[PDB]
């Protein structure tokens with residue numbers, strides 16, 4: 001269970017019912033806002049997010065018109081938006097790095113489903129100040145806030161890249177290197193669902 | 202390194218560690234172009250908004266939300282029922298202070314209801330350099346300490362600064378928003394008919410019509426106000442020289 005796990009896959013076609021239930025879901029979708037790997041608005045609506053959690057939180061990165069489309073998806077999938085994290089993007093000297101204003105931040109919606117119990121709400125605040133890395137690399141600080149919020153629990157990241165794999169997390173994305181599963185329950189259900197190790201439409 | 206961890210360790214918000222050409226000739230033009238300040242005490246709930254003429258190029262809307270008071274507020278029920286589309290010009294802009302809770306969603310519902318699309322999300326980030334100790338009382342639904350507020354910008358019709366304002370968190374019971382929002386708005390050069398709904402004596406500003414329930418005095422006259430924009434000044438941006 002505990003060490004990093006991941007599945008190289010097309011998230012549109014993976015049967016996510018094999019993965020079980022998660023205290024936290026995080027997604028950084030390739031929204032159709034203006035690209036290879038883009039999902040249309042309908043594909044995002046149809047993602048089977050609802051099977052992934054009974055009680056917990058969803059972290060959904062949004063930009064441009066996905067500020068509104070992500071809210072639509074959040075509600076369609078069964079969540080209520082209860083917070084919004086902004087990451088203020090800095091250089092190495094802590095200076096700050098949409099056609100009306102220059103953009104100093106990225107947004108991450110925070111949704112809740114059910115009635116999560118035993119989370120450490122209010123330990124962190126809703127502003128991240130962290131350095132920009134490569135194009136579209138989210139700050140690692142978010143994993144720390146999520147771990148302090150829900151220590152030790154199972155988490156799943158959608159549309160992650162190899163540098164996103166973390167202990168306690170299962171990472172899904174089509175640029176990951178193969179399949180690396182260690183949780184025996186997930187291994188069992190994966191082999192039954194995918195006896196030949198292939199994930200097709 | 203990790204300012205989030207540092208906030209957990211010390212109570213200093215991450216924004217406490219953010220560090221900081223001639224855009225002043227433009228500010229001078231804005232100043233020469235501005236109309237006299239005009240202002241009207243009005244109970245907006247009981248007020249027929251349509252008596253405010255002419256149609257506005259820019260509307261700044263600052264309804265007093267209950268969440269601003271941790272020491273008469275407007276609910277999003279009340280705010281949604283305002284008839285803002287009846288006074289907005291067919292090409293115009295709106296800046297709606299939404300707070301940090303359900304207003305981030307219901308403010309977007311309002312924008313769409315009045316015929317706008319959101320084109321920017323302006324975040325007022327509050328530092329706590331002078332009170333690292335003072336923790337926050339959390340809204341029941343909140344997952345994190347809320348240390349910012351959002352002002353949504355919307356556009357209707359056909360068609361510099363950063364989308365961040367950073368200031369120290371005001372004293373408790375001070376509901377005032379950073380004056381920097383006016384600077385951002387005026388630097389867009391969107392026209393000269395500018396309305397600030399739920400403004401106060403303390404926010405009255407050249408170039409703006411201020412309408413609100415707590416104003417102590419009024420000088421608004423619809424005919425006088427319209428005369429500021431009659432030919433040849435009808436389509437000035439507020440960033441150009443006055444017409445001789």
Ligand SMILES: CC1(C)CCN(Cc2ccc(C(=O)NC[C@]3(O)CCCN(c4cc(NCc5ccccc5)ncn4)C3)cc2)CC1
Nearest residue numbers: 009010011028030037038061136137138159160173174175
């Ligand atoms: C700064 C931010 C916080 C971070 C960046 N964000 C935007 C963002 C940009 C890039 C990636 C990224 O690189 N993510 C890895 C990927 O592999 C990339 C490719 C599609 N992607 C898929 C796509 C998929 N099915 C769809 C599909 C469609 C056509 C052909 C094949 C597959 N299934 C699994 N993963 C996932 C992620 C987010 C902004 C804010």
